[PDB]
Each structure stands twice: as structure tokens, then as C-alpha cells.
Amino acid sequence: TEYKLVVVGADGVGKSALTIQLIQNHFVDEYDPTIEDSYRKQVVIDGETSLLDILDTAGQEEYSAMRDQYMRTGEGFLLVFAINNTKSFEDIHHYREQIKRVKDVPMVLVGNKSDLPSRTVDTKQAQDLARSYGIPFIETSAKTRQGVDDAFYTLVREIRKHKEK
Ligand SMILES: *[C@H](C(=O)N1[C@@H]2CC[C@H]1CN(c1nc(OC[C@@]34CCCN3C[C@H](F)C4)nc3c(F)c(-c4cc(O)cc5ccc(F)c(C#C)c45)ncc13)C2)[C@@](C)(CC)C(=O)O
Ligand SMILES: Nc1nc2c(ncn2[C@@H]2O[C@H](COP(=O)(O)OP(=O)(O)O)[C@@H](O)[C@H]2O)c(=O)[nH]1
Ligand SMILES: [Mg+2]
Secondary structure, three states, rough: OEEEEEEOOOOOOOOOEEEEEHHHHOOOOOOOOOOEEEEEEEEOOEEEEEEEEEOOOOOOOOOOOHHHHHHOOOOOOEEEEEEOHHHHHHHHHHEEEEHHHHHHOOOOEEEEEOOOOOOOHHHHHHHHHHHHHHOEEEOOOOOOOOOHHHHHHHHHHHHHHHHOO
């Protein structure tokens, strides 16, 4: 069983650091901000051996029929914002609507950088936003690995739930 997962959200929220934490179990400080790449990881989730294909998005903001079709291949999306960056949180509506445009799509709201003291987005605002979308909210830190497996595995569970419909 394979799951095509896509990680989306504003520049600098930690999409690459979250992806590398899942794949390598290490925190990366300076992953090239412009690079969009995909990685595979074999995991066992709820007893089921799964191949996660994770697309870590990046690059210029462009919309082409080609990019729409590429995004449409994703089966589940992590909507990542950073808890110390209000604009990244405000941009979540944009990412969710782009996914719905190109595709009931499995998604998880991820509030990353949970280790920082400089919070600007409170937990309740994010919980409320996730509730309005009918999706889970997971707090993470790519630095300490808090919530990292939970965010990806919850996304896989959401895909499984969608496939049952
Ligand atoms: C920054 C960088 O890597 N990125 C910037 C933010 C994330 C990536 C790709 N970029 C991008 N940006 C937006 O919206 C940004 C913003 C803020 C400025 C004005 N914009 C409109 C809103 F206000 C939010 N959206 C993007 C996309 F929607 C997509 C994309 C494109 C298509 O065709 C379909 C699609 C379907 C589902 C999706 F989830 C997405 C996504 C994502 C889709 N593509 C990119 C995108 C800009 C960088 C590191 C540049 C390398 C930097 O600035 O230095
Ligand atoms: N403290 C802290 N820093 C993070 C975390 N995630 C990413 N970073 C840092 O934030 C910056 C941007 O992260 P990156 O993964 O490149 O963001 P991306 O543009 O969304 O791919 C880098 O300096 C990362 O080391 C986190 O959870 N906590
Ligand atoms: Mg990146």
C-alpha cells in the first residue's frame, strides 16, 4: 500500500524540516528553501505496512495546468503553518482552497515550531480552524520531533477513512 502525501504551507514554516525528520530522524537547519522534492519511507501504521511518498513543496508561486495535475496526484495534504508566524496561519485557507480546486480531501492542520517561546498563533485559533474544516490539528516541532510521526500517521488514517467512503 502506498500513500502520496503532500506537505504545503508558507515559506519557512518547516515543511522541509518536518519531511526530513520523518525520513531521516534528524533536524535540518538549512534545507535549500527553493527546492521541491519527494522522498519515500516505509512505515507500519496500525499494523499495516505502508510506503509513504512525501512531496515537500517549494519554489515560485506559479499555477499551471501541469502543477495542478501534479498536485491533484496527492492523496493527503499536511497544511503547515508556524506558530510564531501569523501570516503563515492566515495563508492556510489559500492552501486548502487550492487543494480543493485541483481535486472531501484528506488533510491535517499542522502547527509547527511548537518548541519556540515566541508564539503568535494560539492553540485555540488553530483548533477552531481545523474544526471548521472537519480535520485534525496536530502541534509539531521538527526540532524536537514532537508530533512529527503523529502528523504524518494521522494523515494516513484520514486517507484510509476517505477510502472507506
Ligand atoms: C517561497 C516558497 O517556496 N513558496 C512560496 C509559498 C510556498 C512556496 C510556493 N509558493 C506558492 N505560494 C502560494 O501562495 C502564496 C501566497 C502569499 C503571496 C501571495 N500568495 C497567494 C496567497 F496569498 C498565499 N501558493 C502556491 C500554490 F497554491 C501552489 C500550487 C499551485 C497549483 O497550480 C496548484 C496547487 C494545488 C494545491 C496546492 F496545495 C498548491 C500549493 C502549494 C498549489 N504552488 C506554490 C504556491 C510561493 C520561496 C522559498 C520560493 C522558493 C521563497 O520565497 O524564497
Ligand atoms: N525552532 C524550530 N525551527 C524550525 C522548526 N522547523 C523548521 N525550523 C527552522 O525554520 C527554518 C525554515 O524551515 P524549513 O524546513 O526550510 O521551512 P520550509 O520553507 O517550509 O521548507 C529553518 O531555519 C529550520 O531549521 C521547528 O519546529 N522549530
Ligand atoms: Mg523547504
